[PDB]
RNA sequence: GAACGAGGUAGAUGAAGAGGUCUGGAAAGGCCCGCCAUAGGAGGUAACAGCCCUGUAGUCAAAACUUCGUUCGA
RNA sequence: GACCGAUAGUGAACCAGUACCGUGAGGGAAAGGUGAAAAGCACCCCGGAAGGGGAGUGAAAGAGAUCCUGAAACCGUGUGCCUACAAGUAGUCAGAGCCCGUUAACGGGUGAUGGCGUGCCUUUUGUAGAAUGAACCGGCGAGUUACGAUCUCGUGCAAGGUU
RNA sequence: AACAGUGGUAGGAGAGCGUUCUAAGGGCUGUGAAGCCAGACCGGAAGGACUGGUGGAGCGCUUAGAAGUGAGAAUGCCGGUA
């Protein structure tokens, strides 16, 4: 928890101490797995329906008398084995979301953050000020920081100004300090964190 | 982690048992439900307490006494729990609520005498067991009943 | 659409690429445009009424307008379009240039 | 029983590459290079397009009807 | 949209609540796909036409009006080996002869002749069974979901856990 | 390494194979994918490759997830042909 500090133009200042209780924690493989799975499942809206036998606009009459005919003894026209359809045990509108314990979710977020810290892909960027909405300014910022792949940036106050600049380029996300999760962290492989948000998340956790 | 090597907690995963598909997995033609029994047909189960017309055990047995609306169930707390408080403190139900020793005040706290206690207290409880009272008095506190 | 009947035009894609041409046809119903000297389909012709002809005819066929853009009237290269108002009526202005149409 | 702000109903404006080269019937594709991005939504474009077209982010627009907030007792 | 993609999905992607059936209430279908652009076949020959052969268009005509792909049943034409003194759940294991030459390996096709041998499925104590079902090919077609309960396993906390 | 075992109906238990979509990583594809057709290849099996022909735009692999997930029979339904 002694990662270096970085400026807008890549200049590095004296490193910053981080709460070991949040960033030095040994990551929990399994808890991180379930935490990922959690909202990965809850995100889907799960809207699907297929017309069961009862609601296929038809059926009704016995197609032919029970006995005295060379055909199979049958029921209404809209029945599962018939071509007319009517599915059996099909999908149904249902939610794919649940809840996890407070301790578990806190441990998950702490674990993923500490995993990033030990992998040394965290980059603390104090005071991500920006005077304009223009994207190529922040593209130059990322180039100066050598941020090539996906990334996430959190800046709490400059979110209003910086979100417009960042949102298009090119799949990077701007989130607020309260918006951290497990997928939004893991998926982006590079976390940009402003010092105000450092201590804010530190206090929250 | 990264997503592209997700691995669950091994032993916390099991594939479903897709009954009634082929013979290689057993449970084929019969779907693991025998031959032509009443149990073998859809919705073919029976009432859980049924006994084939032989009168069930519950109905053979007699009924027991009543239950009434009035009932002072007291949140039990033993002396062993009281040790967690410091020396010379005043312990009362409202304090017990925040400290979490009881999650439901209920009809009222009641002190029970199981444990070993050596601390000085002013204990304020709705009821006291005979042994618990003398136990806290020996410990040096005063069992004053609410 | 950006192109208009009676314009000088250059085509972007197809067998015919970047060849100058003049426009007389337009099909906004389906966004197709006819240029001279492009899409030389050879039609097979049975006689039209009293026309005593049987022959192979070479004539234009329409292309999709997306494969088309105009030129800058100043520098001649092939450029995008823009809309501007010149004293009431609107007009067409090519980008990277102040001239109209 | 007025004039006032915001919408709704038609719409307007809207950045950046026929970049070179290879194959091919046809480049939106491969190789090497640029640019815009508050716009990398979507669709079409002779194949898979942020930079080809319609459009998109933002910014505007109403002659006529129409829905919301300000005036006229003990 | 971790919903379907033309037996699906609305009965109905297509002039469908239509054709059709019924006196009537009512029941109730099938049927999507040329090509980028019709550039949809000038002209010639057989033919009454249909339909062909050429020629031409197009990246493809084997792409020509069910017109992208075009499986199987089914129907044909050539053919390498075998077959008119042999009865065969039709195979397998031996096996001469003849023919061919492979994802090269103690190869491929056919097989005169010998040994053995009564299909599959269900249901039954028992089936080759003269007990039942399948004319054949293709598609479709059956133990799920919700809410609770319980048990094993895996997790975070633990005399607390938990919204 | 030694020793022992390895018929199996109803059943119980465990290992897996394949299919459709979804995420992460990788890349295959008009220098011809999917699908179909034919091979004398590989694995203990479900199965999987490789080489040709057709076809003319999409698609495998890797880890995990969720299932309308696997047909030979139901005098099954529909279509086609004996």
UniProtKB/TrEMBL annotation, chain A:
SUPFAM superfamilies: Ribosomal protein L4. Residues 47-84 are annotated as: Disordered. GO terms for cellular component: ribonucleoprotein complex; ribosome. Keywords: Ribonucleoprotein, Ribosomal protein, RNA-binding, rRNA-binding. InterPro entries: Ribosomal_uL4, Ribosomal_uL4-like, Ribosomal_uL4_dom_sf. It comes from the Bacteria. Residues 59-70 have a biased composition (Basic residues). One of its GO terms (molecular function) is rRNA binding. It holds the Pfam family Ribosomal_L4. GO terms for biological process: translation. Belongs to the universal ribosomal protein uL4 family. NCBIfam families: rplD_bact (TIGR03953). PANTHER family: 50S RIBOSOMAL PROTEIN L4 (PTHR10746), LARGE RIBOSOMAL SUBUNIT PROTEIN UL4M (PTHR10746:SF6). One of the primary rRNA binding proteins, this protein initially binds near the 5'-end of the 23S rRNA. It is important during the early stages of 50S assembly. It makes multiple contacts with different domains of the 23S rRNA in the assembled 50S subunit and ribosome. Part of the 50S ribosomal subunit. HAMAP family: Ribosomal_uL4_B (MF_01328_B). This is Large ribosomal subunit protein uL4.
UniProtKB/TrEMBL annotation, chain B:
Residues 1-13 have a biased composition (Basic and acidic residues). InterPro entries: Ribosomal_uL15, Ribosomal_uL15/eL18, Ribosomal_uL15/eL18_sf, Ribosomal_uL15_bac-type, Ribosomal_uL15_CS. Residues 76-144 form the Large ribosomal subunit protein uL15/eL18 domain. One of its GO terms (cellular component) is cytosolic large ribosomal subunit. It comes from the Bacteria. One of its GO terms (molecular function) is rRNA binding. Belongs to the universal ribosomal protein uL15 family. Part of the 50S ribosomal subunit. This is Large ribosomal subunit protein uL15. The gene is rplO.
Automatic annotation (TrEMBL), chain C:
PANTHER family: MITOCHONDRIAL RIBOSOMAL PROTEIN L24 (PTHR12903). Keywords: Ribonucleoprotein, Ribosomal protein, RNA-binding, rRNA-binding. The lineage of its organism: Bacteria, Bacillati, Bacillota, Bacilli, Bacillales. Part of the 50S ribosomal subunit. One of its GO terms (biological process) is translation. This is Large ribosomal subunit protein uL24. Pfam families: KOW (PF00467), ribosomal_L24 (PF17136). One of its GO terms (molecular function) is rRNA binding. The gene is rplX. Belongs to the universal ribosomal protein uL24 family.
